[PDB]
Amino acid sequence: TRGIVRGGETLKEHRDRLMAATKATGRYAGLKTLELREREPILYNKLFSRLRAGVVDARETAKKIAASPIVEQEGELCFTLYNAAGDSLLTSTGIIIHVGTMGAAIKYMIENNWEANPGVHDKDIFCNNDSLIGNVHPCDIHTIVPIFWEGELIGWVGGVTHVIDTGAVGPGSMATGQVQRFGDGYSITCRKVGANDTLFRDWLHESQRMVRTTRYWMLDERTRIAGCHMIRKLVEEVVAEEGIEAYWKFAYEAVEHGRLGLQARIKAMTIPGTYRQVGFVDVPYAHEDVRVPSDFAKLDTIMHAPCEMTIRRDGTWRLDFEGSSRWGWHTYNAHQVSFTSGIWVMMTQTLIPSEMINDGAAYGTEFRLPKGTWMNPDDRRVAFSYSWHFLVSAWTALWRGLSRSYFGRGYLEEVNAGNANTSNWLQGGGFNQYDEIHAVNSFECAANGTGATAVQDGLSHAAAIWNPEGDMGDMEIWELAEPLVYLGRQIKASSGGSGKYRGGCGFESLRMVWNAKDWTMFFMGNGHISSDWGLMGGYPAASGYRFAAHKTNLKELIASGAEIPLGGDTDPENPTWDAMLPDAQIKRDKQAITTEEMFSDYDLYLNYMRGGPGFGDPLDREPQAVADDINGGYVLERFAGEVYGVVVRKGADGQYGVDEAGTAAARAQIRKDRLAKSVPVSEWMKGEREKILAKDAGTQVRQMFAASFKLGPRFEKDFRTFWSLPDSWTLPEEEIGVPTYGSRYSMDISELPDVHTVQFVEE
Amino acid sequence: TRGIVRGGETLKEHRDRLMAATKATGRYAGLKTLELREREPILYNKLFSRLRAGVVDARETAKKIAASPIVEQEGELCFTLYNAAGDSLLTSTGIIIHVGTMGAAIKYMIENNWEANPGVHDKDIFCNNDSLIGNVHPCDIHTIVPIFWEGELIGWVGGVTHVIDTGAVGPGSMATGQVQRFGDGYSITCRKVGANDTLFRDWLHESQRMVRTTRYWMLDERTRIAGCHMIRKLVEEVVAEEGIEAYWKFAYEAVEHGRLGLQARIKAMTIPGTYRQVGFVDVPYAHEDVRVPSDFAKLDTIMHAPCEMTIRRDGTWRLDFEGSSRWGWHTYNAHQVSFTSGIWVMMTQTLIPSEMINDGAAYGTEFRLPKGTWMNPDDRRVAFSYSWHFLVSAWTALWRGLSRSYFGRGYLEEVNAGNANTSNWLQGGGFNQYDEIHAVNSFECAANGTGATAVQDGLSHAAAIWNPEGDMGDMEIWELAEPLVYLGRQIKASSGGSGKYRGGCGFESLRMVWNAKDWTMFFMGNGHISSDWGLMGGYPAASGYRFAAHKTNLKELIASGAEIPLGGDTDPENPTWDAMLPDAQIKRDKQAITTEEMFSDYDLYLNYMRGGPGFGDPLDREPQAVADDINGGYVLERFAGEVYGVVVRKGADGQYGVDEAGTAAARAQIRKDRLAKSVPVSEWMKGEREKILAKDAGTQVRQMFAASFKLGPRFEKDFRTFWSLPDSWTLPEEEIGVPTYGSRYSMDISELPDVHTVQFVEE
Ligand SMILES: [Mn+2]
Ligand SMILES: [Mn+2]
């Protein structure tokens, strides 16, 4: 029975052959030479130039079909072209993390003999979003079309859209509320959803009633299908015009070219050696306003992600996450594919922007993700809807590590202290201004600030780790899809991390609920803990907080001519809105994660997008920059002196200027205070060691270590050595008093029948 | 192109033709005469006898394929045979409410042009459980196979199994936790799940990872498929032996025969006139241990289900539920198909046992269910997982109403005061004794007690409204599938409703958690309110309560030989176990509905199945019966005197005997006390009327009326008339202080694209 691949081999035989060559030889598919590229270089780039333009243009055109602004204006969609074995050749920009996620679904089909059943046929249509096979979160939905030529498969197209909602318990796309997979939303596992280019009615009727924002989902489906088919047609025209021979060579030489590309850029931009760095984020599920149904999920915890980054003389490199913490009862878990494609999107943004963007760099990187950590769970009950919470707090560390190598070597233009927490996600549900069931999810946190450089300040309100082409979207467009009105949009002062170069500031949006019925809202970002750290000096960006006002009496206040709250929440420590709202129930605290809360018309919700970390000692910053930050609204005048040692005087014009003698003398005095207030690290260490031996820390600090030691013995060994702790000191998780469900017992997806999962990671 | 039905017409043309004949003519399909039955009655019964044997025997055989005891021992499975238009011809016994649910699924396909897409092809396999189309709850999963003959559809087979769990937020089948459809478990809308008699791999992988109890679910599929295919093969053999002409006549004359049967039985057993009755149950979501994520769902409420039953001189009859309450944010909502097939299952149990069991009676009954009530919701966010809560408390009223017509006419053998609340459902989830993810759901409440008769006492621990073939299942078999050990099984004293004839007692099961890991449990029945009422006298059965013991210290108690709790909780007002467990956290209260709660090995959970209501004035009971009840454990000795006026004396043997002279005087004395403590109803009425005018009642009493008034103007008009209330007195729901989400705004499933829903009810 002939296999369907161009060879006559099956999908499985074909890929198994290619991975064997790759393993044995060290080069993708065994390609020790690139025949087309070396011998017919003109033909090689013409294919590259024409096909990469095709997918770029497909994404840009098709996104005019969607109703949701996330797809139509922000561009949270991607199109990828794959070879037979599910390796990408080329991609449009956008949410390119799904280069790898959709590649792994293609491989899951390959490895579980979809070929025999349900069959991969021409004109078929597959839809998938299953996180257990490596997708980021259910709200990101794939369409996958096989491409055939003269009767045989020659590759695949994938299209991803980020969809408003998938019917989880939480109303929104990064939803809280649910604590397991069951309730985490509509989960599609590589389903055959069409044949002969036409969708199945039983998929249409079932799928559309599993969600709130049906019209939005329906159109997000057509944006995918139209893109896939523009790309399928593109390929056929390219093959018919240049030949299957060349196309077939290109479909694999391109992928080894991407591996060759990563190696060469490492060797030219980096330094061999070892780099160590760590990242944390908070999960405050103890609080009253995280109302979750399962009692075993109400505890505070901290995500712990240490990375040992090894860079070798031959230009390979290794990322070891030994020491990391366990998955939990929340929606912040991830998958080994999620995680590693995340690290790949980062190398598309600094290491290989000017090389082939495809799975080549993936084959040139080594990943060790211990089984059972949050980044590699071993449990099929796990939940995913806001994977970015953990994911974006782990990858930010690696910017710093990678930036020390550019800095030592002299490529200071490339240093970057890391990504912002891509957060607060305005979410809610109910009846909207068209009186339809609806959900919300602002992609304003596509435009957080970004890490400072060794050369200049980070960009404000500019980007996210998962899409560098930032877009905040127009106020006038968002108000077509949410039942809220804007009372402010404002640069978020003192959100940027301080330094010689200041991190990018976030921004803020103040909303009034308007024309909503039976409406709820919630918040979802980091509160207690800043994920990014500064670099070579350099402080973390600000962390998160919440602001909601209920019963504002704002109908009367608007109408009677009284003061009403406008703009941003400029100094949350000295607020101005609260005085204006004497009757309101104001929620102003650090609890940056909540579940659904009744809101009504004229209630208030502050949307806050985070800043980025800074670079260098702050009192090396040029004083004039500090003064300009004060006028430009970037830094509150209070910290000009307290952080930068800059003394500013207001001119007749009302703007701030530099007092130079004052600024020098204040900097001189800060240096003596630093000497006087610090102590030798020897001294501090024996103090902290006493606290450790006494087990003096909150339950969430003690749980992070207990769980981390159990998954990563080399990390426990290192902690014990560092603090010089007796073997009599032990930290069993079960002694901390907090629930410990899922700490010993777990069941993996691979323990279910007929499941063959693909491994991409050392594990 | 040509339709698929044996005629050459499409499914839709075929049914549309037949429903028009039925509307114009008053007889199913226009059959004013029954050709086969009148002309070849021998051939007519031979087809009937062989086919009903086939479905009975198919259900019986295939249930030996299941691992879950729900299907294998208790038989909560059903097989039904349908004509082309989706009308049942015959059924096996068991959970026959799905006669109507699978018929409504077949008809939904007919109306939405499944024929065009995805196509109804021979050898195909459909799977469905969608409650918006009229299924009881997600856990009841249908398999639907078309039957073809010489290339044309001649009917369908449906198979139903109750599945342990479908991946709702709650672990169990009657799950709490979720408050909307989103989270209420895996919802399949008439999916084509196989072709050429083989299941699709993408359905297999996806479906098995959306639930906990996977191996159980897998085998429940094979039990369904096998029964369908035994029945498809059966028909073909019957047709090949007797001819398509005869079978095609039978497939429709059978259904008008059933309508004729309902009419003849009404006219023979009943009295024409009007019957009025009502039913209630509790929903105290206000309590701390109902932890739901949505703040708009935390309130107490009461289901209000009034029925005006009209029986006519021509033998038709009408059931109007005007006045009923609204659907809510819980899992107790229903659907018009759910509700009406319930009343049909009830009429199979008294009215037509000896007639054709098929849709004939459905065509002979009139139903009016106001749109927007809990029984006919107009909102597609609604949740269903424990529909029986409302459903079984509504139908019990109709037994009483129907019983007054037997009692007046003299068929006292047929009187029954109503069904028990079929409840408490022991449920929970975690890791079981085989160290696999698992969920539990005891079907011990298939064997509640039943209503007393005009002739004799109700049966104890015997049946449920949805399956009169009660089975409590073996202890030894239940312990193969739950990580619990039985410490007692006991008739539940004083659970039966008191009367001249006592209602049936429930029973109770005391469990110890054993060999469980990361384990939770919860409760799900009625607490505050008894659904059934007694009759012509007659008190309701006991209502519900909860008992759990945590930290029992029972390992130590067992090992040391101290007292351990065994058996049942004989007198909850004077317990013996609580003293035995001095270290325990004991939960003993009325809160019969909880969400998930951590349990551990040696903790205790009491499973309580309810009793049935009684008949007649209790102090007409033969005193000897009261004495036997006391010894037999049915009634606690305290109430012999207080309820029955029976004075019982303990003998030399230790058993109770009747004090005859004492019992006469006590009965003489009770009658004088009854006079002395009652008042003229006029007197009592003006007191209660002041309370109404003063709005003196719990928020749950005031919300039940507010919601009912808005949905049922004739009920408000009638309330106001009865209590003589000014037009100045008004009860707006929004003044009661509790959330009112979904009270004005709603969006029906019929408002989504391409949705054509079928109407079976006056509405
Ligand atoms: Mn997304
Ligand atoms: Mn069921």
| Determination technique for this entry | X-ray
Distance (Å) of CA B43 to CA A230, B29, B35, B50: 62, 21, 11, 11
Q: How many CA atoms lie within 13 A of B179 on its CB side?
A: 27
Q: How many residues does chain B have?
A: 763
Q: Which residue numbers come right before each break in chain B (C to N over 2.5 Å)? A: none
- Considering only alpha carbons, which residue of chain B is nearest residue A112? B201
CB spacing of A209 vs B520 below 8 angstroms: no
| Cα(B678)–Cα(A349) distance, integer angstroms | 86
- What spacing in Å lies between the alpha carbon of B139 and ligand 2's midpoint? 5
- Give B381's contacts in chain A (Cβ within 8 Å): 212, 437
Q: How far is CA A154 from CA A80, A151, A418, in A?
A: 14, 9, 39
Rounded distance between C-alpha atoms, residue A291 and residue B285, angstroms: 14
**Helix B623-632 crosses helix B637-644 at what angle (to 10 degrees)?**
160
* Residue A596 forms contact with B (CB below 8 Å): yes
Mutate to test the interface with A, among B114, B203, B205 (most CBs of A within 10 A): B205
Residues of A in contact with B208 (CB under 8 A): 752-753
Cross-chain CB nearest to B189 (options A206, A292, A755)? A206
Q: How far apart are CA B247 and CA B40, in angstroms?
A: 12
A56 C-alpha to ligand 2 centroid (Å): 51
Distance (Å, rounded) from C-alpha B553 to C-alpha A435?
56
Token code pair at residue B654:
């230790």
Using the beta-carbon criterion (under 8 Å), do A181 and B170 form an inter-chain contact? no
- Residue A69 half-sphere exposure, CB side, CA atoms within 13 Å? 19
DSSP bridge partners of B512:
B485, B604
Distances (CA, A) of A744 to A147, A335, A565, A741, B432: 45, 19, 51, 8, 14
Chain B residue numbers with beta carbons less than 8 Å from the beta carbon of A430 are: 741
d(CA A568, CA A551): 20
Amino acid at A323: G
Residues of A in contact with B210 (CB under 8 A): 181-182, 187
The rounded distance, in Å, linking the Cα atoms of B32 and B41 is 16
Q: Taking ligand 1, which is a single-atom ion, which protein residues have CB atoms under 5 Å away?
A: A 139-140, 162
**Bridge partner list, B587:** B548
- Asked whether the beta carbons of residue A291 and residue B296 sit closer than 8 angstroms, the reply is no
Give yes or no for A185 touching B (CB within 8 A).
yes
- Work out the burial of residue A413: count CB atoms within 10 Å of its CB; fewer than 13 is exposed, 13-18 middle, 19 or more buried: exposed
CA atoms within 13 A on the CB side of A490: 23
**Contacts of residue B672, Cβ cutoff 8 Å, sequence gap at least 6:** none
Count of helix runs (H) and strand runs (E) in chain A: 20, 22
- Closest in A112, A178, A214 to B201, CB measured: A112
Distance from CA of A514 to the nearest CA of B (A): 16
Task: Considering only CA atoms, give the Rg of chain B.
Answer: 26
Which among A202, A597, A742 has the least Cβ separation from residue B295? A597
- Give, as residue ranges, everything with CB less than 5 Å from ion ligand 2: B 139-140, 162
* Resolution of the structure, angstroms: 2.7
> In chain A, whose CA is at the least distance from the CA of B211?
A182
Q: Which of B132, B208, B517 sits opposite A752 (nearest CB)?
A: B208
Neighbours of A40 (CB within 10 A): 15
User: In whole angstroms, what separates CA B512 from the centre of its chain?
Assistant: 28
Tell me if residue A719 falls in helix, strand or coil: helix
How many angstroms separate the alpha carbon of residue B81 from the centre of ligand 2?
20
Q: Which residues of B touch A200 (CB under 8 A)?
A: 117-118, 192
Nearest chain A residue (CA) to B194: A118
- Say if CB B513 and CB B472 are below 8 A apart: no
Among the bound ligands, the one closest to the CA of A74 = 1
Distance from CA of A150 to the nearest CA of B (A): 27
State whether residue A170 sits within 8 Å of chain B by CB. Answer: yes
Contact in structure between B177 and B168 (CB atoms under 8 Å): yes
Q: Which amino acid is at A116?
A: A
Cβ of residue A326 closer than 8 Å to a chain B Cβ: no
Q: Determine the 3-state secondary structure of A14 from DSSP.
A: helix
Closest-approach residue (CA) in chain A for B166: A182
* A188 CB-near residues (< 8 Å, 6+ apart): A127, A128, A129, A130, A141, A207, B206
Query: In Å, what is the CA distance from B12 to each residue of A401, B9, B245, B425, B755?
Result: 67, 8, 22, 41, 15
| Contact yes or no for A292 and B293 at CB 8 A | yes
Record the tokens describing residue A654, joined without a space. Answer: 């009302």
Q: Where are the alpha helices (DSSP H) in B645-698?
A: 660-677, 681-693
Please give the Cα distance from A252 to A284 (Å, whole number).
47
Q: Do B202 and A187 touch (CB under 8 A)?
A: no
B140 CA from centroid of ligand 2 (Å): 5
Q: Does B191 touch chain A (CB under 8 A)?
A: yes
* A-chain residues near B755 (CB < 8 A): 205
Nearest CA in chain A to B739: A598
Q: Is B752 on the interface with A (CB under 8 A)?
A: yes
* Contact of A158 with A147, CB cutoff 8 Å: no
**Contact criterion met (CB < 8 Å) for A206 and B188:** yes
Which residue of chain A comes nearest to B206, CA vs CA? A189
Interface test with A, best of B200, B202, B437, B741 (most A CBs within 10 A): B202
Q: Tell me the C-alpha distance between B182 and B382, whole Å.
A: 9
CA angle A344, A349, A355 (to 5 degrees): 80
Q: Which of residues 686-705 of B touch A (CB under 8 A)?
A: none
Residue A293 alpha carbon to ligand 2 centre in Å: 23
Q: Locate B694 and state its tokens.
A: 């003063």
Is B32's Cβ below 8 Å from some Cβ in A? no
Residue numbers of B between 502 and 531 with CB closer than 8 Å to A: 517-518, 520
User: Which chain B residue is nearest to residue A290, measuring alpha carbons?
Assistant: B293
Ligand nearest the Cα of residue B467 is: 2
Q: Looking at the CA of A70, which ligand is closest?
A: 1
Q: Looking at the partner chain, which of A189, A381, A436 has a beta carbon nearest the beta carbon of B206? A: A189
Q: Do A596 and B295 touch (CB under 8 A)?
A: yes
Q: Phi and psi for A605 in degrees, rounded to 5? A: -140, 120
Residues B708/B321, Cβ–Cβ less than 8 Å: no
Q: Collapsing DSSP states into helix, strand and coil, what is residue A173?
A: coil
Contact B314/A at CB under 8 A? no
Contact A598 B214 (CB under 8 A): no
Which residue type does A111 have?
E
What does the alpha-carbon distance between residue B407 and residue B396 come to, in Å, rounded to a whole number? 17
CA B600 – ligand 2 centroid, Å: 28
CA distance A715 to A370: 12
A136 CA distance to ligand 1 middle (Å):
7
The shortest CB-CB distance from B190 to any of A130, A202, A741 is to A202
Taking the C-alpha atoms of residue A341 and residue A361, their distance in angstroms, rounded to an integer, is 10
Cα end-to-end span (Å), chain B? 36
Residue ranges with strand state E in A331-421: 365-368
CA distances to A36, A260, A264 from A40, in Å? 5, 18, 22
Q: How far apart are CA B635 and CA B638, in angstroms?
A: 8
Q: Which long-range contacts link B575-582 to residues 24+ away (Cβ below 8 Å)?
A: B577/B549, B577/B604, B581/B549, B581/B552, B581/B553, B581/B554, B581/B557
CB contacts of A183 in chain B (<8 Å) are: 168-169, 177-178, 182-183
DSSP calls for B468-511: SS-----HHHHHHHSSEEEEEEEE-TT-SPPSSBPPPP-EEEEE
Pick from B89, B528, B454: nearest CA to B287: B528
Q: Which residues pair with B275 in a beta bridge?
A: B309
User: Touching check for B722 and chain A: CB below 8 Å?
Assistant: no
